[PDB]
């Protein structure tokens, strides 16, 4: 029912190897829909989902102009940040920015985001109010003073409450076949002997969309959080995701263990056990 649109941007400097590489991608929920890479032979924003292909040339021209301009401002920003941190011009550095909006079932703004990181560390973020800033350090306070003076937050609020939510509504409708379809996990339990004394039970969730899922093991009805190996949810490459959770079970105890699965495509949570 709830949805999100996010744009991600990364610039990475490479002194002596030309200008910083800029890569930006856009997502609705867990679906990639646009990309731009300054190292492409002829950089243009390109479609990555079928429902964005119908946007006309004016959209692609505008988006491409925005991406090219952002690549250039990021290069200026990388030069500025070397000054703010008293750094030399010899090393590679990273500048990241994410922004976008979350909406609920009725399409209304739930919250907006616009935040930056430098060298993998939080730098400055627009607060949930869309009106004030959180700066991580005294360098970012210099940016905060500039952005307060220029009323940047007001510009971001206008976009996040307005255009961002309106684009997301449009995309959700044009992409209603897929963006508004949850694919439930296909689930099963496997058993993997380790020694005469114990075996692994592995609970699998495959083919699901969106990525959010909860997979847990209980023993005699008690959660086994500390003893569960839970891998990161991972992309299958066909739009869907995979996950598994594994516990080490003493011989003969297998029926005391239950795997529990929660996903928005399931009308009710599932309980599974090993079935020899």
């Amino acid at each position: 029912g709830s949805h999100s649109m996010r744009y991600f941007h990364t610039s990475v400097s490479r002194p002596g190897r030309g200008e910083p590489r800029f890569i930006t991608v856009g997502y609705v929920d867990d679906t990639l829909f646009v990309r731009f890479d300054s190292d492409a032979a002829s950089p243009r924003e390109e479609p990555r989902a079928p429902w964005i292909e119908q946007e006309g040339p004016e959209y692609w021209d505008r988006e491409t102009q925005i991406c090219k301009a952002k690549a250039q401002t990021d290069r200026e920003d990388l030069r500025t940040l070397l000054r703010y941190y008293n750094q030399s011009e010899a090393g590679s550095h990273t500048l990241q920015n994410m922004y976008g909006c979350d909406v609920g079932p009725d399409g209304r703004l739930l919250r907006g985001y616009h935040q930056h990181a430098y060298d993998g560390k939080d730098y400055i973020a627009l607060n949930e109010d869309l009106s004030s800033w959180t700066a991580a350090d005294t360098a970012a306070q210099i940016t905060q003073r500039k952005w307060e003076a220029a009323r940047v937050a007001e510009q971001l609020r206008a976009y996040l409450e307005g255009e961002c939510v309106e684009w997301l509504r449009r995309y959700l409708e044009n992409g209603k076949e897929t963006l508004q379809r949850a694919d439930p996990p296909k689930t099963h339990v496997t058993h993997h002997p380790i020694s005469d004394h114990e075996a692994t039970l592995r609970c699998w969730a495959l083919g699901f969309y969106p990525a959010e899922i909860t997979l847990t093991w209980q023993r005699d009805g008690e959660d086994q959080t500390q003893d569960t190996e839970l891998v990161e949810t991972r992309p299958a490459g066909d739009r869907t995701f995979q996950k598994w959770a594994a516990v080490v079970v003493p011989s003969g105890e297998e029926q005391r263990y239950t795997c529990h699965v929660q996903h928005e495509g399931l009308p009710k949570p599932l309980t599974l056990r090993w079935e020899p």
């Binding site: 505008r62 925005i66 401002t73 930056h116 940047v152 971001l156 255009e163 684009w167």
Partner: peptide, 9 residues
């Protein structure tokens, strides 16, 4: 669709 506001640190 993207934000079109140039913003420099």
């Amino acid at each position: 669709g993207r934000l079109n506001a140039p913003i420099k640190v």
